Write a protein that binds this DNA or RNA. Structure first.
Lengths: 161, 65, 116, 55, 95
RNA sequence: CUCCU
RNA sequence: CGCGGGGUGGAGCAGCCUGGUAGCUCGUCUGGCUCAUAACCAGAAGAUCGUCGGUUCAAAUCCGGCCCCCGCAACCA
RNA sequence: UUGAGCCUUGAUGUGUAGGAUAGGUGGGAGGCUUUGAAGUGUGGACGCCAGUCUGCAUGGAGCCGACCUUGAAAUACCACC
RNA sequence: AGGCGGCCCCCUGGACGAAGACUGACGCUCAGGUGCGAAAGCGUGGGGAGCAAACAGGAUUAGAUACCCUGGUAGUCCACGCCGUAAACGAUGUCGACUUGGAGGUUGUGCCCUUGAGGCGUGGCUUCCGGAGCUAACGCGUUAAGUCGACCGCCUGGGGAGUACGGCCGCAAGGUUAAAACUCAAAUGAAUUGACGGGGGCCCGCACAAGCGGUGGAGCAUGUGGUUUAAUUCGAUGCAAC
């Protein structure tokens, strides 16, 4: 908004594992205001991600996540008649949430029988650098890196951190 | 313009004198003969000069800050 | 290929494009690269980044002439003109001197009337 | 409904930067207090260079 | 662009609907892609007035014209709408 | 872009 | 009526500059962008390489035969 | 200056497989070398960025073939090209 | 007055000031007349880089005989004639006298400690701000739009109209002089309060951006318009009726 760096509230961590990133991930596919069955989808998917990956579950999810987190993201701008996209760097809070949104959408596609099987296979190919969300990641990097020639005025991401 | 010197050199001096007199006369001469409005633009520029000087001079009284 | 030592790097830096012509001391050309031919097209030619990629794609394909040090002439009041010489400090060259060959007539011919 | 963003200090910066880029070579539309006028003019002079680098 | 005639105290005859529709179609073709148009005809004991609301991509735009015989009011409203459309059209061209 | 009283 | 050259996405053609895997613009299909069309950008399929043969490990590439073009001619029953 | 043709020569011919920038076919365990060896003072070509040619040593008297992988075995050596 | 910008030469006009000398009212204005008069244009002869009406093409657009882009001929240049108009403007005729100040510019000159780019005066031309006074106000304000004097030009509601007819000038384009019928009760100047702007500055809003879920496709419910009917009671209709 115009005003208000807003008084921000935190979230509850995940019960089964010591993670708030995982609780955010439950809140992403928590469709229709119903947390419990989304928790059953996430747990049911990390179990078969462990059996279909061998390694542990939290590192399985995080290694599967860092192959879809982005670095540069386009912002569409128009000046005059043109309307070109300008690469902004993603801030590392927006980064992993923007990854998990693509994982969850690419799991709502892809359709297998169950949602835990779809999301389990989608995280598996996210470890394999093979699935859909890595194609969307590489689309974002190809068009921001393709439109890389724009670093300008003041409407985005002041001096540094 | 012409910068040659020893090992810390090559950028600041040159973009200074280059940028000022270059961008001035090329950005001026790049089009618009005008024949008539250097007269108007110098008249407005210098009337704005005396109005800015007298305006700041009598604006040097107070501002209640 | 000629095994030249020093060169003169002319940079034509107009508004809509920058072209970079690396020549020798004599004044006859060795290799050139433009801000249009580096993949950038139309309005995107008119950026400093396309001038930087132009200076890269000239500074190699003049490797076979073996230039250690070069002068820099820059003609044109364009959006390149400084990123393209940062891209020649960074390209592995020794900059002897930098001049300005922007043609300033002691007003002669009449310019066009262009805008409304 | 919360409080003002970057309390005129580096908002005074980007007002002087936008006003610097879009012409306005007055440098005569600033604030009047010192801690905001200083970087309205700071953004103005940081915007003159960003006008030289582009059209 | 479909057009939606209604009338408060003005009995919309079939010859009245043919003319209004033709005028609106002609205006729509001339200035911009228009999605829907509502026409309201009011009579208040003297003033034959007309309202129109055009829903166009940019948004709503409205005009109103009082006349003498209903037909005159409609003509005024259509010219006003055309003028408004020119403003909206290159208001969202603005290259 | 930084040369005033 | 015999010499030459061509048969490769829908089309124009590279490849055959060296026998070892089929390539570029458009048209056609997405997606981003745009008020929508456009323009820009990023991806994708698009061929048993004109058909039969054979020449060696392996042929779009090399060689026969046929068909289709385009030129050069021979065109004085 | 420069084509084109003709000799005399001299280099070049990494798909896959892999000790390897092996061109084909045939013959084929004999030449290399102290006519002062592998490395490199050296200097290039090629360069399908990995290997081969030759210039001069200060060294100085050494190397492969059949025997490992291949449709193929070695510019180990020679002939015809 | 129009206007006149590299540098040098030749011919030539005017202004200014210091100190004197000289003539002795020789002065001011001026209808008619004569002269000069930007640019465009016209005639003759040259010249033609760049630019650039006309013109072609590409765009843009609903259309685009336009703005934008790519080209491009007259013209722009010179010599000699013509035209004689301009927002030819300071929208302020010329000449003369008088009437508080300030800050500057430029150009001479006098005195004194030039002893230091110093100080005090004095003429000319010029820029801005303001005093009384004036003005409808805006503003003008010793360079007046203040107070006066001499002479000239011009005005008498807006449109018709600086047009027609006639005269004069011009190669032409056209210039000058200059009506009337008709028609309206207004036209106008300056300033004010709003409103408006594809004017500016600042702040804010689910206004955009970042997202979540919808409507528009479907069936059904309910309301409205239309059509029907004997009646389909009446009202609510942009947002702010459905």
């Amino acid at each position: 908004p115009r005003r208000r760096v807003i008084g921000q509230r935190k979230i509850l961590p995940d019960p089964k594992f010591g993670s708030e990133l995982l609780a955010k991930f439950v809140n992403i596919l928590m469709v229709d205001g119903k947390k419990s069955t989304a928790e059953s989808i996430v747990y049911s998917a990390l179990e078969t991600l462990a059996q279909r990956s061998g390694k542990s579950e939290l590192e399985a999810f995080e290694v599967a996540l860092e192959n879809v987190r982005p670095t540069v993201e386009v912002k569409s701008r128009r000046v005059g008649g043109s309307t070109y996209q300008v690469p902004v760097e993603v801030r590392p809070v927006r980064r992993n949430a923007l990854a998990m949104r693509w994982i969850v959408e690419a799991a709502r596609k892809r359709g297998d029988k169950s949602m835990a099987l779809r999301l389990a296979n989608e995280l598996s190919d996210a470890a394999e650098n093979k699935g859909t969300a890595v194609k969307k990641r590489e689309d974002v990097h190809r068009m921001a890196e393709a439109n890389k020639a724009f670093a300008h005025y003041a409407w985005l991401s002041l001096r540094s951190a | 313009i012409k910068v040659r010197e020893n090992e810390p050199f090559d950028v600041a001096l040159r973009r200074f004198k280059r940028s000022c007199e270059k961008a001035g006369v090329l950005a001026e001469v790049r089009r618009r003969e005008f024949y008539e409005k250097p007269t108007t633009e110098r008249k407005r520029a210098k009337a704005s000069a005396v109005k800015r000087h007298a305006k700041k001079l009598a604006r040097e009284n107070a501002r209640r800050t | 290929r000629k095994q030249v030592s020093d060169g003169v790097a002319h940079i034509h830096a107009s508004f809509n494009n920058t072209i970079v012509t690396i020549t020798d001391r004599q004044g006859n050309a060795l290799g050139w690269a433009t801000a249009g031919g580096s993949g950038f097209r139309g309005s995107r030619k008119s950026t400093p980044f396309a001038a930087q990629v132009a200076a890269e794609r000239c500074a190699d394909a003049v490797k076979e002439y073996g230039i250690k040090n070069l002068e820099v002439m820059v003609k044109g009041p364009g959006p390149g003109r400084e990123s393209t010489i940062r891209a020649l400090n960074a390209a592995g060259f020794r900059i002897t001197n930098i001049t300005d060959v922007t043609p300033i007539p002691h007003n002669g011919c009449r310019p066009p009337k262009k805008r409304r | 409904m919360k409080r003002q963003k970057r309390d005129r200090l580096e908002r005074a910066h980007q007002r002087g930067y936008q006003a610097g880029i879009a012409g306005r070579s007055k440098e005569m539309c600033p604030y009047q207090t010192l801690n905001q006028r200083s970087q309205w003019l700071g953004g103005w002079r940081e915007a003159m260079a960003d006008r030289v680098v582009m059209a | 662009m479909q057009l939606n005639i209604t009338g408060n105290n003005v009995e919309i005859t079939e010859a009245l609907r043919e003319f209004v529709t033709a005028k609106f179609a002609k205006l729509e073709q001339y200035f911009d892609r228009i999605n829907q148009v509502y026409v309201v005809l009011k009579v208040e004991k003297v003033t034959h007035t007309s309202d129109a609301t055009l829903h166009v991509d940019g948004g709503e735009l409205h005009a109103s014209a009082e006349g003498q015989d209903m037909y005159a009011a409609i003509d005024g409203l259509i010219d006003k709408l055309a003028r408004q459309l020119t403003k909206h059209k290159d208001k969202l061209k603005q290259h």
